[PDB]
Write a protein that binds this ligand. Structure first.
Ligand SMILES: Nc1ncnc2c1ncn2[C@@H]1O[C@H](COP(=O)(O)OP(=O)(O)OP(=O)(O)O)[C@@H](O)[C@H]1O
Ligand SMILES: Nc1ncnc2c1ncn2[C@@H]1O[C@H](COP(=O)(O)OP(=O)(O)O)[C@@H](O)[C@H]1O
Ligand SMILES: Nc1ncnc2c1ncn2[C@@H]1O[C@H](COP(=O)(O)OP(=O)(O)O)[C@@H](O)[C@H]1O
Lengths: 359, 559, 333
DNA sequence: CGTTTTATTTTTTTTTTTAAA
């Protein structure tokens, strides 16, 4: 995809490899192959190779220092100024989407989606989990897909793809019926290539009444078996998701329940724990921030907000936080009961369907 | 081979001389045990083998099969020398190993051929069990009869869906079994094997297409079952037959949270029944249970049924529609070769259960099968080549979801969740979960797991409750129910007050007896009655209009 | 002529005679087999060991030299012999673990006079042979199950089978009808042990005997078949009563979708419609409207007239019957 | 101057198409 032509498609080509090169390949990566094209002695063409070149030794904002490992997070000396000074959050609200403007809640909330979740040390009787179900809606002509597209540049396994096109067989493979190799290879797919990754998708809207068969699995079961003419096994969902439906005439007219403002399926709004909508208003002084930002959008000199936190130092510091594993005997953690209680005092009014899945 | 001299000595000096673990070594006795069970699978453990002499790991792999010859000759020469009595019957032998090191799938490669191996697998579809040929004979003119045989079945294994390398493809391998190690494979189990690696005798050796068609094949010397889902008595016979057990068992019934002490009583009864008692001249009558609750999205109607999966003598689980099929279309067209068509799982675990969420979601043509099991103890394949049936001595349970939302009030339950009525005519047991306003400290403590009945027997007591004690009786005082019929047909007359029947107490009849299944009573009094009524008294009051006191004064005297 | 089972007999038990017992399933027809015939080329009765293909000797040969290799052997069946076949079939017991496992079975083989003897839904004891059909050394050698027959011995299960294969009982019959007390007496018999229809059960006296299919000189064949009804709520023993009625002439009984509108020798079988067990047999069933409306035309053809026909393929079964129904109910109010 | 030739069927998933109060 670094190479992409007009008209033509990433056509397919086929290859073998050796023992030490073998089974050391994963989802969408950038390696350096060897150009030893070779014939078929049937003819037709083939090719061959012998060499590939696809975080203990450190990421960007470093030079070598010490850590738990060699340089896995070694550069605390420079991170830590940007670790604790809690206004750094505002860099993570400001110095990350300077070319973009919307609500300031998403731009202060997504980060933990990108970052590891819970991963605790408890039962075998049942799993506990880290990540969360997620959404975003509004109506178009509000810049509600810039961000998803950007993630594909921002973050790993930010597989920005459409959902409009996909089938229910988008996810795994479906069938073979001749000796392709062994007459039963139906273990190819689309999702579990999330190698510690997420699959956020567009156009969740006109989608079918079968996708939920996978999303029902999302945060409890995370397992993968098929009722085909093959076999059944299972796999581990590593992944969260994004929501990409939309309304009919758009506005979620504030006279009917927000469930009923689209009125989609039964359990979907049980599992998705935050929706985080931006809905339209008409107060044009709102709008006159925008174009006067795009005053430097084409005018090529510093055509955004001045930054304070590069992409690469951001991306490196993501890891430092994922190997600490907090320990919660928090008395305030015991006074969440009062927090949740005064919450439900607010839930008592405006009488949605609420429970511990939101806890 | 003069080497062959010493090896059998090192066996012969080892099978009938060795002692370990403070005498009467198994090898003195396993053979005769085998001989008394006519088994031909006398076992060795490599750990003991290396405890004596580890030299048998390093002259083995130049050909382990000749090692096995050098094993069987010794064994044979022990049995018929010591049991020449045996010299009549089968009079052939091989042995087993259980190098007890777990090694893994997806590692056998170029350098793992035909050598000392130790591996696992997980089993799925394969064929029947059939025979082969064995011997070198055919000639006389200057043979296809009297030519000894040996059974055969094909395998298929699969690998752990737990220890997977994260989106690496689940894999597959073709492997063999043989006659004596046969008729133990079934779908969906794992089995640990000694294992040994080769290819076909000749897998397409020739100038060929742009890649050879080669396979790779294994068989077992030993198989040791890893799953073993059927088979310290001082607890049960003294503790598990009281009616205090509806605290003791209820102490350990649902170790998740305190909530909803009713169903502790319920599940304290739910696995605890089943009865034939077919009458004379009429038919076979009834021995089924039939249960459901209407939950809520946020309740526990998904996480509703889990714990009993592992424990029961029989259990068969299915989440409901979403991926439910109709296979749950048989012209009497027996499954011809490479043609496969399937049929209903109700008879499998006949006298077991169907564990269900999304019950109300499934397809009516499957519901046809699901219904009459519970009504006429039979069901009817519909106008195919055969109009066959499927035997139903079994039980029905589920975990459905409401209709059109979350939950309906004391307003009737057909509209609380949209089943049918004539399916519900055969339904037995009920409970309901709503909540208004300890646990939070519980939930956070349970989220801080940094890391009464015994657990490793508790089935065989319920086997005893499903096995042992089975009295019956005449009308003790249940003529009382001519009021519960007539009065509450007519006092609770017109709000929601039809659902009172003899099947409303045939339901009771199934479990009033079962108090003695719990207790090993050998009789029944009004003691077990009133507790059964405490269940009807409590389940029923929710299934009637918000005139709710209609049960309370009317029956809490019978509490 | 000590019985056995199917999961007990294998490689050891080959070329050997056995006693076991099972339950018939279905089987094929009666085709063919001979013992000998001959060929023009030599004209010898082609002696056979077992019930090869004339190697190199031709015998259109001794004509001088002029030779005739590679079989001028037109097999001449006008000289032949002739035998039968059925290829018979069994299912194992309902007692030997088909529950957590699958019920296995095998195929059988007969010879001459023992066909036209056995049909499905029967219970058998047998003696055969464990023999073979294939050859060998199939990733190595998987091969042949079957058996043949020698001398089966079937069962006589009790009191049911006045079906296929006294006058004191007529004295039993008639001295009760000598009494003119049957019309209302057997109004407490058809439910011989429980309550219902009591003073109105007299109306069955007409239906089981029926009226009379009194044909005419003119077109019509009148409605000797005539129909009756029941309808109501559950709890009245209405499920088990008609359950008994199958026990008390011949029919089938459930309601709706559950009767109701092969990979071998390229012939399309069609087992038929609803006069199968009901043409002399009659039925009594629930769920009329509780049933699909695609299979609710037939009732209108079945019932008021037996106006039967066929249209899947191009031929017309002109069927009829002396059959009838009752209806059962859980309809509205 | 001799000694040998030749066959495959059912199910998937897509894109087409089609059904009832
Ligand atoms: N706060 C904002 N920051 C940046 N751009 C904005 C903002 N508000 C509006 N815009 C501009 O308005 C345009 C809205 O049209 P746009 O191309 O986003 O449709 P879309 O949101 O992609 O539709 P959909 O999300 O349904 O596919 C965007 O191109 C965006 O540049
Ligand atoms: N009474 C209760 N007892 C224990 N856990 C509860 C109870 N009520 C709610 N929960 C919580 O609900 C969660 C499960 O919600 P869930 O069953 O998945 O909703 P759904 O059935 O719609 O998928 C559990 O993790 C559990 O902690
Ligand atoms: N008068 C009666 N005599 C005997 N049994 C009865 C009587 N009334 C009801 N029953 C009971 O009703 C049950 C059958 O109910 P059923 O007709 O199946 O209800 P439904 O028609 O709703 O399915 C029988 O098991 C029987 O015990």
């Amino acid at each position: 995809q670094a190479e992409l032509p007009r008209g033509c498609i990433p056509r397919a080509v086929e290859i073998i490899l050796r023992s030490e090169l073998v089974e050391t390949v994963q989802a969408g990566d950038r390696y350096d192959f060897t150009g030893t094209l070779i014939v078929v002695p049937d003819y037709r063409m083939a090719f061959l190779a012998c060499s590939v070149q696809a975080t203990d030794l450190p990421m960007s904002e470093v030079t070598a220092e010490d850590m738990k490992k060699q340089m896995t997070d070694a550069e605390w000396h420079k991170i830590y100024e940007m670790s604790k000074d809690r206004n750094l959050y505002q860099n993570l609200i400001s110095s990350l989407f300077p070319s973009i403007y919307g609500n300031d809640e998403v731009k202060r909330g997504i980060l933990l989606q990108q970052f590891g979740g819970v991963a605790k040390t408890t039962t075998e009787k049942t799993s506990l989990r880290g990540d969360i179900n997620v959404c975003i809606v509004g109506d178009p002509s509000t810049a509600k897909s810039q961000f998803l597209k950007q993630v594909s540049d921002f973050s790993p396994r930010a597989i920005y793809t459409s959902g409009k096109a996909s089938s229910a067989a988008g996810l795994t493979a479906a069938v073979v019926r001749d000796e392709e190799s062994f007459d039963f290879v139906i273990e190819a797919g689309a999702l579990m290539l999330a190698d510690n990754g997420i699959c956020c998708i567009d156009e969740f809207d006109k989608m079918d009444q079968r996708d939920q068969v996978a999303i029902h699995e999302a945060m409890e079961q995370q397992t993968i078996s098929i009722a085909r003419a093959g076999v059944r096994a299972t796999l581990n969902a590593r992944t969260s998701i994004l929501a990409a439906a939309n309304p009919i005439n758009g506005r979620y007219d504030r006279s009917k329940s927000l469930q009923q403002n689209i009125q989609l399926s039964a359990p979907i709004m049980s599992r998705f724990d935050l929706f985080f909508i931006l809905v339209d208003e008409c107060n044009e002084v709102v709008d006159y921030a925008i174009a006067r930002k795009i005053v430097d959008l084409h005018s090529n000199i510093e055509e955004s907000v001045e930054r304070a936190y590069t992409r690469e130092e951001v991306l490196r510091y993501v890891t430092f936080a994922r190997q600490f594993k907090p320990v919660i005997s928090q008395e305030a953690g015991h006074m969440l009961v009062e927090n949740y209680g005064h919450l439900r005092q607010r839930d008592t009014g405006t009488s949605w369907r609420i429970t511990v899945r939101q806890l | 081979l003069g080497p062959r001299t010493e090896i059998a000595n090192r066996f012969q000096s080892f099978l009938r001389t060795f002692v370990d673990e403070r005498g009467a070594y198994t090898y003195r006795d396993r053979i005769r045990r085998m001989c008394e069970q006519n088994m031909s699978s006398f076992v060795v453990s490599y750990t003991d083998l290396a405890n004596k002499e580890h030299v048998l790991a390093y002259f083995l792999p130049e050909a382990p099969f000749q090692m096995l010859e050098i094993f069987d000759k010794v064994a044979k020469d022990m049995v018929l020398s010591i049991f020449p009595t045996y010299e009549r019957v089968t009079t052939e032998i091989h042995v087993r190993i259980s190098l007890p090191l777990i090694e893994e799938l997806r590692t056998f490669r170029k350098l793992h051929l035909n050598q000392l191996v130790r591996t696992l697998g997980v089993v799925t579809a394969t064929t029947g069990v059939l025979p082969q040929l064995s011997v070198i004979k055919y000639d006389c003119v200057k043979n296809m009869e009297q030519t000894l045989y040996r059974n055969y079945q094909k395998i298929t294994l699969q690998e752990s869906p737990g220890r997977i390398p994260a989106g690496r493809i689940p894999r597959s391998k073709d492997v063999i079994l043989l006659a004596d190690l046969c008729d133990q494979c079934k779908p969906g189990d794992e089995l640990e094997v000694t294992g040994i690696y080769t290819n076909n005798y000749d897998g397409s050796l020739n100038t060929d297409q742009g890649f050879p068609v080669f396979a790779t094949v294994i068989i077992a010397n030993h198989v040791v079952v890893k799953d073993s889902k059927q088979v310290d008595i001082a607890t049960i016979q003294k503790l598990s037959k009281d009616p205090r057990i509806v605290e003791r068992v209820v102490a350990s019934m649902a170790p998740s949270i305190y909530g909803h002490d009713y169903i502790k009583r319920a599940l304290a009864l739910a696995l605890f029944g089943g009865e034939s008692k077919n009458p004379g001249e009429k038919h076979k009558v009834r021995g089924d249970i039939n249960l459901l609750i209407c939950g809520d999205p946020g309740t526990a109607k998904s996480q509703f049924l889990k714990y009993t999966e592992k424990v029961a003598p029989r259990a068969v689980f299915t989440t409901g529609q979403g991926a439910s099929a109709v296979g749950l279309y048989v012209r009497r067209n027996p499954v011809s070769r490479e043609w496969t068509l399937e049929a209903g799982a109700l008879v499998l675990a006949d006298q077991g259960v169907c564990l269900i969420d999304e019950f109300d979601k499934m397809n009516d043509q499957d519901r046809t099968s699901i219904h009459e099991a519970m009504e006429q103890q039979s069901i009817s394949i519909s106008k195919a080549g055969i109009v066959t049936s499927l035997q139903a001595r079994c039980t029905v349970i589920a975990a459905a979801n409401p209709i059109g939302g979350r939950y309906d009030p004391s307003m009737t339950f057909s509209e609380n969740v949209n089943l049918s009525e004539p399916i519900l005519s055969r339904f037995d047991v009920l409970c309901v979960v709503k909540d208004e306003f300890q646990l939070a400290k519980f939930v956070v403590h349970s989220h801080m797991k940094h890391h009464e009945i015994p657990q490793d027997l508790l089935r065989q007591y319920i086997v005893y409750a499903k096995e042992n004690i089975r009295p019956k009786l005449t009308n003790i005082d249940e003529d009382k129910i001519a009021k519960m019929y007539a009065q509450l047909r007519q006092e609770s007359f017109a709000t929601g007050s039809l659902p009172i029947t003899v099947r409303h107490i045939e339901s009771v009849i199934r479990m009033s007896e079962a108090h003695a299944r719990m207790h090993l009573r050998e009789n029944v009094m009004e003691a077990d009655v009133s507790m059964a009524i405490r269940m009807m008294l409590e389940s029923f009051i929710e299934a009637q209009k918000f005139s709710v006191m209609k049960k309370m004064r009317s029956t809490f005297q019978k509490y | 002529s000590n019985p056995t089972n199917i999961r007990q007999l294998k490689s050891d038990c080959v070329s050997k005679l056995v006693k076991i017992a099972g339950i018939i399933v279905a089987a094929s027809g009666i085709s063919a087999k001979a013992t000998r015939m001959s060929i023009q080329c030599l004209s010898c009765s082609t002696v056979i060991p077992n019930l090869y293909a004339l190697p190199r000797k031709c015998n259109t040969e001794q004509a001088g030299r002029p030779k005739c290799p590679l079989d001028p052997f037109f097999i001449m069946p006008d000289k032949c012999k002739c035998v039968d076949f059925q290829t018979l079939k069994l299912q194992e017991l309902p007692d030997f673990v088909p529950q957590g496992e699958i019920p296995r079975h095998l195929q059988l083989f007969c010879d001459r006079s023992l066909c036209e003897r056995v049909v499905p839904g029967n219970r058998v004891l047998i003696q055969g042979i464990y023999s073979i059909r294939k050859v060998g050394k199939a990733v190595v050698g998987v091969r042949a199950p079957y058996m043949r027959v020698v001398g089966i011995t079937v069962d006589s299960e009790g009191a049911g089978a006045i079906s296929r294969y006294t006058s004191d009982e007529e004295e039993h019959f008639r001295r009760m009808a000598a009494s003119g007390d049957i019309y209302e007496r057997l109004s407490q018999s058809l439910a011989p042990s429980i309550f219902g229809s009591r003073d109105i059960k007299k109306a069955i006296t007409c239906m089981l005997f029926g009226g009379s299919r009194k044909r005419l000189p003119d077109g019509l064949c009148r409605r000797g078949d005539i129909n009756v009804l029941l309808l109501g709520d559950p709890g009245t023993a209405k499920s088990q009563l008609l359950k008994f009625v199958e026990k008390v002439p011949i029919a089938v009984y459930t309601s709706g979708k559950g009767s109701s509108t092969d990979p071998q020798t390229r012939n399309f079988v069609m087992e038929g419609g609803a006069m199968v067990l009901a043409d002399g047999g009659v039925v009594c069933i629930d769920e009329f409207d509780k049933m699909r409306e695609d299979d609710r035309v037939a009732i209108h053809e079945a019932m008021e007239q037996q106006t039967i026909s066929i249209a899947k393929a191009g031929i017309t079964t002109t069927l009829n019957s002396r059959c009838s129904v009752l209806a059962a109910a859980n309809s509205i109010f």
